[PDB]
């Protein structure tokens, strides 16, 4: 119940922080099974009852609905990364600009540091590959990283929890927006010092900050009343 | 008739939601079951306010055959596209923000990302801007330049999409506008883009244009326009 | 009817994203000589109601309505005196038109919707700081000449219409034209202008009273809220 | 009244699009060595008057319910260095952070940028509370604002209304500069004498307070016609 509620909030947060590209969004949580948003729904309409548990053959083991067959590749990532418990893939507007231009992230600001030495870049675009080819390609290119920019496609985040995968997704999208806006006006950016970036990376990825931020974004999706007159 | 008008009303709300307003420049039509006629949004209304009763059926002379209202005379040229393209049943024309950047800069789309592929080998580019021609000349110019494509970027003007259904014309419109936004933002920061392989782009084009995906995506966007309740508070 | 039209013009300007603190100005020439209708000081365009528009004279005395005029609108009298054809003036520091003003870049007519400003947008290259009405009015009236709009370097823009509907339509079209030009030049460099003869025909077509008034009425309905489809 | 003013300042910052839990706001307390601030874990968009607490130099809550955001402790060094400052805002707002990330100072080229003319410091070093406070107080000097390289910005006002006004004007000035440079390259600055006159005009209390009250009314919702 807690997992489905967390996944529903993660979906609403991703929709609120403007990540939508038709029905291209995917989310999963490790259960050889995984929890995922049922087929045909967007992140903005997800409720706890829309998350189903499914095996390697995409058979539903718990809940009502069918899995989005495009999430089958997530099993290869979970198999390669025992530390990963949640995966998010979207074609969000600004991260997809970096993907389309074949441009890796350049760590030049405090909030970009959760991706410092933690964002892989897959240069090859295999088109619409089958689940197995995509899983092997993405697991290999991801390596031990928390995120990957997929050239000509979008991005994927891989977190130890659904809260961490969501936090990485939002921070990667905002980091991409900052980099694209800054390079359009001023050209290539000078990165910050690697040692200080690694310290800021560890600071921003502490569970207390990740969970408090996820809970804040969750409250924002529910609506906040203006101050009374 | 009722289902056609309801589909057109949702298409208008979806275009408005996906931010495509430039005054009353927006046009939408659906080929009528009656020869020589088309359904279209009545004059004076924006896409964001369209309801089923705002779609009227008009003839080649712009006489209203069915419904209450007068046609936007600027939609008369659509008849030439329908005549040239028996496969086309719905047309959308707008001056949306990002697609109009490409049109203004005389820059064709460069297919460099998965969601740009429904326009791969499917977007014509009219390089000449003819000013404000009368519907007949506008119709011949646009039908000839469109050829067999699903979309066209009209230099110094905007774009047009031509679908087998109103759902397909809307899907092409949204994907073209988002593809143009991605390209403009990418080129402003990084310069010209590297196009993806043509064969893989054509496969992704065919995958994304399957009727099941087009209709499910149109229905999803239709639900979005109606408002989605937030998750409840405890 | 004048106060209602001005209230809708204000809501339209706020909706179409022109906001910059309380820097906005709007006026309509009064039927009474030497007077003009304007939004009262301290209110933004987004909160304007018909009762917030007052009629004021050259000395900023309130002739009709409740409230005090924004003294920064005094120079509008100089434009009305120089242009008998002008009945409504709008000045704001809208986001995109102000990028052109800040960069000292005139509009380049390269798309259909930019044509209402073709041969109709002056450019004041000098920024006089915070001048008094006497100086600002002469500077702006002289630079505007017979045009419908002017980009004011390092400041913003002003539109001058035969009606409040036309001043509003010019304001929205200028802001969107500036957005299109800035976005296009950032990605692709300087633009190719369209043919002058065709641009003048498109200018006349888009400035016809029927399309100006239908568009103003459409934007008016949008500010009031539209219910989603059931 | 202080907590209500801070609640409106928070809603205005959220409305004028500044969100990155990175946001900080404080007001110097009437009690020496203390400051009022938004409690930990809340964003500016949800702040109510009861969410502002009074805290001491050791981050102990003196008044109200809640714990302070420990990252606000450095505000004490700015208050100690600047007796004229009574409110401080720090955010990583979208456009001001573009300038900070690119190490680009503001170039005063338009009327609404003038409240920052000769009033915006630039800290070039990114150090990754005692060290942060000394570094930021020294770099800020006597200015109303500072762009912090690779980080964000801070404003320091004589009132919460002035800190909020400086925040909004700096973010909009950064947006204007970034959009203009992307399309047209480096900007020509306006005349310094005229910029200083416009700076003084726009920072008059009547304009600052009327503008803050206008933005406060906007956060509450305005009925359509
Ligand atoms: Ni994908
Ligand atoms: Ni058109
Ligand atoms: Ni002004
Ligand atoms: Ni910070």
Residue numbers in the entry:
A (entry chain B): 28 to 58, 62 to 259
B (entry chain C): 27 to 260
C (entry chain D): 29 to 258
D (entry chain A): 29 to 48, 50 to 157, 161 to 257
The article reads:
The enzyme responsible for the core function of heterotrophic nitrification is pyruvic oxime dioxygenase (POD). POD is a non-heme, Fe(II)-dependent enzyme that catalyzes the dioxygenation of pyruvic oxime to produce pyruvate and nitrite. Bacteria of the genera Alcaligenes and Pseudomonas are known to perform heterotrophic nitrification, which produces nitrite from ammonia using pyruvate oxime (PO) as an intermediate metabolite. PODs have additional sequences at the N-terminus consisting of 20–30 amino acid residues that are not present in class II aldolases, corresponding to the disordered region of AfPOD in its crystal structure.
The crystal structures of AfPOD and AfPODdN18 were determined at resolutions of 1.76 and 1.55 Å, respectively. The structure of AfPODdN18 crystallized in the coexistence of manganese was determined as a tetramer containing 918 amino acid residues, 682 water molecules, and 4 metal ions. The overall structure of AfPODdN18 is nearly identical to the AfPOD with a Cα root mean square deviation (RMSD) of 0.3 Å (845 Cα atoms). The anomalous difference Fourier maps suggested that the electron density near the His triad in the AfPODdN18 is not a manganese ion. Nickel or cobalt ions may have been bound to the His triad, rather than manganese, during overexpression or purification. The dN18 variant of AfPOD completely lost its enzymatic activity, indicating that the POD-specific N-terminal extension of about 30 amino acid residues, which is not present in other class II aldolases, is essential for catalytic activity.
